[PDB]
Symmetry: C2
Subunit: 137 residues, 2 copies
């Protein structure tokens, strides 16, 4: 197949399926993790680009890893190069970092409903902006 | 890794993640599909064993297929042999067929909330019974 709108949308939908499931069902484990606080610290040291690569992959992989489900973890690893291709299609470092900062604060503060909403929003926003700029190369 | 409780639980949790996501988000497509009715017809023509093998794989693959997301479809295909191994660990034909019949009727009748509940119940019930019998071979 081609690297087209459908490819992009399928990738983001798959991420929503897996990441939201894990955040919803493992919320407390995620909220209490030392990894989350280290990522938060990385973001709070504002270099948007340098903050981004690292923090973004760590945060989204943390949601998945918190399940402890090696099959889920392995499926996410299998699709990671495709996830990463899609990430690199469009640079959105400042705004993604802000969305992450706010997502993390919703998690830590115990706002589970709001955290799930912010993760969905993040992924849909990335999707829309990637599609919006697919012909602006 | 071993074929153990963790392996089984991971499999079922992965199915809940993927199947419930697709049922929830593609409910009307699933409800309006000819395949769903052909499966219903198979289950209602009545031979629990013969009804099961074909119907079970078709029904759960239909939920996934209705997404039209080739990545989700391909990930479910990748895990299918593992899903199928787990299915074959414990024979529940009559009761799984009954759960499927009722799940399908919830879907057809427009009871989306009840259909999602029945799917989750089915998979958790399969899980529990497989674990309960893991040392009765």
């Amino acid at each position: 197949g081609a690297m087209d709108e459908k490819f992009i949308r399928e990738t983001i939908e798959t991420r929503i399926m897996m990441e939201v499931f894990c955040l919803e069902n493992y919320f407390d484990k995620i909220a209490g993790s030392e990894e989350l606080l280290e990522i938060k610290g990385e973001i709070d040291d504002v270099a948007a680009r340098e903050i981004f690569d690292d923090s973004d992959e760590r945060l989204h992989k943390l949601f998945i890893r918190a399940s402890g489900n090696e099959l889920i973890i392995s499926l996410y690893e299998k699709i990671w190069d495709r996830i990463d291709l899609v990430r690199h299609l469009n640079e959105r470092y400042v705004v993604s970092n802000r969305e992450h900062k706010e997502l993390i604060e919703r998690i830590i503060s115990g706002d589970k409903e709001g955290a799930i909403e912010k993760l969905k929003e993040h992924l849909k926003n990335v999707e829309a902006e990637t599609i919006k700029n697919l012909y602006t190369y």
